[PDB]
Amino acid sequence: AEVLVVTSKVKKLIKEKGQMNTSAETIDVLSKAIEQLCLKGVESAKADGRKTVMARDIVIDHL
Amino acid sequence: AEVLVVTSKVKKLIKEKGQMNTSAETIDVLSKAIEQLCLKGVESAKADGRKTVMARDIVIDHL
């Protein structure tokens, strides 16, 4: 339900830049990661009293 | 170049579940996060001598 990454372009990146295939579960993990980053972004934006999720609401520095 | 998240479905999630709009830069951050997670997955898979990026190669526990 609701794949949130562009599967074809992820597979293309991983193949072209890394010489690797991409498992189905890899796509699932990436999609779930996007969902969590979005929900956490909602939490951050609302806590600031805003109505728009902004780049500063997507905390990805631990990457 | 190469947006790696499904922009329409991200905006739909953020609006429907959080009542928020989604800025253009939010989409950019999410896309760059996916790119980094994929490249790091390539590093992990190759270090294990494999030819396929697997779910265990996408380290997202810091979420």
Numbering used by the authors:
A (entry chain A), B (entry chain A): 2 to 64
Please give me the paper's original passages concerning this structure.
Here we report that histones are major chromatin components in the bacteria Bdellovibrio bacteriovorus and Leptospira interrogans. Unlike known histones in eukaryotes, archaea and viruses, Bd0055 binds DNA end-on, forming a sheath of dimers encasing straight DNA rather than wrapping DNA around their outer surface.
It has the overall topology of a histone-fold dimer, as well as a positively charged ridge along its ‘top’ surface that is also found in archaeal and eukaryotic histones, where it is used for DNA binding. Of note, the Bd0055 α2 helix is 7 Å shorter than its archaeal and eukaryotic histone counterparts (1 helical turn shorter compared with archaeal HMfB), which decreases the overall size of the histone dimer. In addition, the α3 helix in Bd0055 forms only one helical turn and the remaining amino acids pack against α2 of the dimerization partner in an extended configuration. This organization differs from the three-turn α3 helix in archaeal/eukaryotic histones, which takes part in tetramerization by contributing to the four-helix bundle interface. A conserved histidine in α2 (H49) is conspicuously absent from bacterial histones. Finally, the surface opposite the basic ridge of the Bd0055 dimer is more acidic than that of HMf/HTk histones.
